[PDB]
Short mmCIF file of all heavy atoms in Angstrom, two decimals:
data_model
loop_
_atom_site.label_atom_id
_atom_site.label_comp_id
_atom_site.label_asym_id
_atom_site.label_seq_id
_atom_site.Cartn_x
_atom_site.Cartn_y
_atom_site.Cartn_z
N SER A 18 9.00 -13.96 12.15
CA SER A 18 9.60 -15.08 11.43
C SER A 18 9.72 -14.80 9.94
O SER A 18 10.70 -15.18 9.32
CB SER A 18 8.78 -16.36 11.66
OG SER A 18 7.43 -16.17 11.29
N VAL A 19 8.75 -14.10 9.37
CA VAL A 19 8.78 -13.77 7.95
C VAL A 19 9.62 -12.52 7.71
O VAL A 19 10.29 -12.40 6.68
CB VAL A 19 7.35 -13.63 7.38
CG1 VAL A 19 7.39 -13.12 5.94
CG2 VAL A 19 6.62 -14.97 7.45
N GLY A 20 9.60 -11.59 8.66
CA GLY A 20 10.38 -10.37 8.54
C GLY A 20 9.58 -9.11 8.24
O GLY A 20 10.12 -8.15 7.70
N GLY A 21 8.31 -9.10 8.59
CA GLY A 21 7.50 -7.91 8.46
C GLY A 21 6.02 -8.23 8.41
O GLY A 21 5.58 -9.33 8.77
N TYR A 22 5.24 -7.27 7.95
CA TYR A 22 3.80 -7.42 7.83
C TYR A 22 3.45 -8.32 6.67
O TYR A 22 3.98 -8.19 5.55
CB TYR A 22 3.15 -6.05 7.64
CG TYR A 22 2.98 -5.27 8.92
CD1 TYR A 22 3.96 -4.38 9.35
CD2 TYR A 22 1.83 -5.42 9.70
CE1 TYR A 22 3.81 -3.66 10.52
CE2 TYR A 22 1.66 -4.69 10.87
CZ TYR A 22 2.66 -3.82 11.27
OH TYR A 22 2.52 -3.09 12.43
N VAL A 23 2.54 -9.25 6.97
CA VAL A 23 1.97 -10.15 5.99
C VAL A 23 0.46 -10.00 6.07
O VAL A 23 -0.08 -9.48 7.05
CB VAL A 23 2.40 -11.60 6.24
CG1 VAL A 23 3.90 -11.73 6.11
CG2 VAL A 23 1.94 -12.09 7.61
N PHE A 24 -0.23 -10.44 5.02
CA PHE A 24 -1.67 -10.31 4.97
C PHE A 24 -2.26 -11.47 4.17
O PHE A 24 -1.57 -12.10 3.37
CB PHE A 24 -2.08 -8.97 4.38
CG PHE A 24 -1.71 -8.82 2.94
CD1 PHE A 24 -2.63 -9.10 1.96
CD2 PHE A 24 -0.43 -8.41 2.56
CE1 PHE A 24 -2.31 -8.98 0.63
CE2 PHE A 24 -0.11 -8.28 1.21
CZ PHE A 24 -1.05 -8.59 0.26
N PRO A 25 -3.56 -11.77 4.38
CA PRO A 25 -4.16 -12.87 3.63
C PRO A 25 -4.17 -12.54 2.14
O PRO A 25 -4.60 -11.46 1.75
CB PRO A 25 -5.59 -12.92 4.17
CG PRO A 25 -5.54 -12.27 5.50
CD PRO A 25 -4.49 -11.22 5.38
N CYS A 26 -3.73 -13.46 1.30
CA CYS A 26 -3.67 -13.17 -0.11
C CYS A 26 -5.06 -12.90 -0.70
O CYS A 26 -5.18 -12.37 -1.81
CB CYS A 26 -2.99 -14.32 -0.85
SG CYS A 26 -1.21 -14.55 -0.51
N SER A 27 -6.12 -13.29 0.01
CA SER A 27 -7.49 -13.05 -0.42
C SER A 27 -7.97 -11.62 -0.17
O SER A 27 -9.06 -11.25 -0.58
CB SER A 27 -8.44 -14.03 0.29
OG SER A 27 -8.47 -13.85 1.70
N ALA A 28 -7.16 -10.83 0.52
CA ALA A 28 -7.53 -9.46 0.84
C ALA A 28 -7.48 -8.50 -0.35
O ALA A 28 -6.70 -8.67 -1.28
CB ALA A 28 -6.63 -8.91 1.93
N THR A 29 -8.33 -7.49 -0.29
CA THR A 29 -8.21 -6.33 -1.16
C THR A 29 -7.52 -5.22 -0.38
O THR A 29 -8.03 -4.79 0.65
CB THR A 29 -9.59 -5.85 -1.62
OG1 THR A 29 -10.23 -6.88 -2.38
CG2 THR A 29 -9.48 -4.59 -2.48
N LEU A 30 -6.37 -4.76 -0.86
CA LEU A 30 -5.60 -3.76 -0.12
C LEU A 30 -6.09 -2.33 -0.37
O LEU A 30 -6.40 -1.98 -1.50
CB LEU A 30 -4.12 -3.83 -0.49
CG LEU A 30 -3.39 -5.12 -0.14
CD1 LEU A 30 -1.96 -5.05 -0.65
CD2 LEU A 30 -3.43 -5.39 1.35
N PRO A 31 -6.13 -1.50 0.69
CA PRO A 31 -6.42 -0.08 0.50
C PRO A 31 -5.24 0.66 -0.11
O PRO A 31 -4.09 0.24 -0.01
CB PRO A 31 -6.72 0.41 1.92
CG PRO A 31 -5.98 -0.54 2.80
CD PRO A 31 -5.91 -1.85 2.10
N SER A 32 -5.53 1.78 -0.74
CA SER A 32 -4.47 2.66 -1.20
C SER A 32 -3.74 3.31 -0.03
O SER A 32 -4.19 3.27 1.12
CB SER A 32 -5.04 3.74 -2.12
OG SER A 32 -5.95 4.58 -1.41
N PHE A 33 -2.61 3.92 -0.34
CA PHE A 33 -1.86 4.70 0.61
C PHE A 33 -1.46 6.00 -0.06
O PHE A 33 -0.86 5.98 -1.12
CB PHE A 33 -0.61 3.95 1.10
CG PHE A 33 0.17 4.69 2.16
CD1 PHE A 33 -0.10 4.50 3.51
CD2 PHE A 33 1.18 5.57 1.82
CE1 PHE A 33 0.61 5.17 4.49
CE2 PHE A 33 1.88 6.25 2.79
CZ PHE A 33 1.60 6.04 4.12
N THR A 34 -1.77 7.12 0.58
CA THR A 34 -1.45 8.44 0.05
C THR A 34 -0.32 9.05 0.86
O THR A 34 -0.34 9.01 2.09
CB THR A 34 -2.67 9.36 0.15
OG1 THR A 34 -3.75 8.79 -0.60
CG2 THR A 34 -2.37 10.75 -0.39
N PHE A 35 0.65 9.66 0.18
CA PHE A 35 1.65 10.47 0.87
C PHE A 35 1.65 11.90 0.36
O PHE A 35 1.33 12.17 -0.80
CB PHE A 35 3.06 9.84 0.84
CG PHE A 35 3.69 9.69 -0.53
CD1 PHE A 35 4.51 10.68 -1.04
CD2 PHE A 35 3.51 8.55 -1.28
CE1 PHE A 35 5.14 10.54 -2.26
CE2 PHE A 35 4.15 8.40 -2.52
CZ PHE A 35 4.96 9.41 -3.00
N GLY A 36 1.99 12.83 1.25
CA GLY A 36 1.98 14.23 0.92
C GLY A 36 3.31 14.72 0.39
O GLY A 36 4.37 14.32 0.89
N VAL A 37 3.24 15.60 -0.61
CA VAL A 37 4.39 16.33 -1.12
C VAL A 37 3.93 17.78 -1.10
O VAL A 37 3.14 18.20 -1.94
CB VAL A 37 4.79 15.89 -2.55
CG1 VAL A 37 6.01 16.66 -3.00
CG2 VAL A 37 5.03 14.37 -2.63
N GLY A 38 4.39 18.55 -0.12
CA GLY A 38 3.84 19.88 0.07
C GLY A 38 2.33 19.77 0.21
O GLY A 38 1.83 18.89 0.94
N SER A 39 1.59 20.59 -0.52
CA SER A 39 0.14 20.53 -0.48
C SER A 39 -0.42 19.47 -1.44
O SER A 39 -1.63 19.25 -1.49
CB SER A 39 -0.46 21.90 -0.81
OG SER A 39 0.05 22.39 -2.03
N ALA A 40 0.45 18.82 -2.21
CA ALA A 40 0.02 17.81 -3.18
C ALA A 40 -0.03 16.42 -2.57
O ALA A 40 0.47 16.19 -1.47
CB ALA A 40 0.94 17.82 -4.42
N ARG A 41 -0.65 15.49 -3.29
CA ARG A 41 -0.86 14.14 -2.78
C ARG A 41 -0.53 13.13 -3.87
O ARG A 41 -0.97 13.29 -5.01
CB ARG A 41 -2.31 13.98 -2.33
CG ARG A 41 -2.80 15.05 -1.34
CD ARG A 41 -2.20 14.87 0.03
NE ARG A 41 -2.68 15.89 0.96
CZ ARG A 41 -1.96 16.92 1.42
NH1 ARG A 41 -0.69 17.10 1.05
NH2 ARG A 41 -2.51 17.77 2.27
N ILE A 42 0.22 12.10 -3.51
CA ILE A 42 0.52 10.99 -4.40
C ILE A 42 -0.20 9.77 -3.84
O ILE A 42 -0.02 9.41 -2.67
CB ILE A 42 2.03 10.74 -4.52
CG1 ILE A 42 2.76 11.97 -5.11
CG2 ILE A 42 2.29 9.43 -5.32
CD1 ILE A 42 2.39 12.32 -6.52
N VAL A 43 -1.01 9.14 -4.68
CA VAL A 43 -1.79 7.97 -4.27
C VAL A 43 -1.16 6.69 -4.81
O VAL A 43 -1.00 6.52 -6.01
CB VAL A 43 -3.24 8.08 -4.74
CG1 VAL A 43 -4.03 6.85 -4.29
CG2 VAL A 43 -3.88 9.35 -4.22
N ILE A 44 -0.76 5.81 -3.89
CA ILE A 44 -0.27 4.49 -4.23
C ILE A 44 -1.46 3.53 -4.22
O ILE A 44 -2.03 3.26 -3.16
CB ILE A 44 0.78 4.00 -3.21
CG1 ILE A 44 1.93 5.01 -3.00
CG2 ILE A 44 1.30 2.62 -3.59
CD1 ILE A 44 2.86 4.63 -1.88
N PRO A 45 -1.85 2.98 -5.39
CA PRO A 45 -2.97 2.03 -5.38
C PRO A 45 -2.67 0.80 -4.54
O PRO A 45 -1.54 0.38 -4.42
CB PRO A 45 -3.10 1.62 -6.85
CG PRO A 45 -2.50 2.78 -7.60
CD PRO A 45 -1.34 3.20 -6.76
N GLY A 46 -3.72 0.23 -3.95
CA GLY A 46 -3.56 -0.94 -3.12
C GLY A 46 -2.80 -2.08 -3.77
O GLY A 46 -1.99 -2.73 -3.13
N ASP A 47 -3.05 -2.33 -5.06
CA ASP A 47 -2.35 -3.42 -5.74
C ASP A 47 -0.82 -3.26 -5.72
O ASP A 47 -0.09 -4.24 -5.81
CB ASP A 47 -2.85 -3.59 -7.19
CG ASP A 47 -4.31 -4.02 -7.29
OD1 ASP A 47 -4.88 -4.53 -6.29
OD2 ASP A 47 -4.89 -3.86 -8.38
N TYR A 48 -0.33 -2.03 -5.63
CA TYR A 48 1.11 -1.79 -5.66
C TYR A 48 1.77 -2.30 -4.38
O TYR A 48 2.99 -2.45 -4.32
CB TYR A 48 1.43 -0.29 -5.76
CG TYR A 48 1.17 0.39 -7.09
CD1 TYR A 48 0.19 -0.05 -7.97
CD2 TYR A 48 1.89 1.53 -7.45
CE1 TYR A 48 -0.05 0.63 -9.17
CE2 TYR A 48 1.67 2.20 -8.63
CZ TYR A 48 0.68 1.76 -9.48
OH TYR A 48 0.44 2.42 -10.66
N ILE A 49 0.95 -2.53 -3.35
CA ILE A 49 1.42 -2.88 -2.01
C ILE A 49 1.43 -4.41 -1.81
O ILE A 49 1.88 -4.91 -0.78
CB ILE A 49 0.59 -2.08 -0.97
CG1 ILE A 49 0.80 -0.56 -1.19
CG2 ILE A 49 0.92 -2.49 0.49
CD1 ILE A 49 -0.27 0.28 -0.57
N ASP A 50 0.98 -5.14 -2.83
CA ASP A 50 0.97 -6.60 -2.79
C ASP A 50 2.27 -7.17 -3.37
O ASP A 50 2.55 -7.00 -4.57
CB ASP A 50 -0.24 -7.11 -3.57
CG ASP A 50 -0.28 -8.62 -3.70
OD1 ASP A 50 0.36 -9.33 -2.90
OD2 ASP A 50 -0.99 -9.09 -4.61
N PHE A 51 3.05 -7.85 -2.53
CA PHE A 51 4.26 -8.52 -2.99
C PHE A 51 4.16 -10.04 -3.03
O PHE A 51 5.15 -10.74 -3.11
CB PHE A 51 5.49 -7.99 -2.26
CG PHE A 51 5.93 -6.71 -2.87
CD1 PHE A 51 5.21 -5.55 -2.64
CD2 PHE A 51 6.94 -6.70 -3.82
CE1 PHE A 51 5.52 -4.39 -3.29
CE2 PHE A 51 7.27 -5.53 -4.47
CZ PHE A 51 6.56 -4.38 -4.21
#
């Protein structure tokens, strides 16, 4: 109904890391809160 994943606004979000070759880019959890 909303159109994707939702979460309780009281939550603390984990980071998400993606790989670029052998390197790693870390997206902090706060960046994932809309």
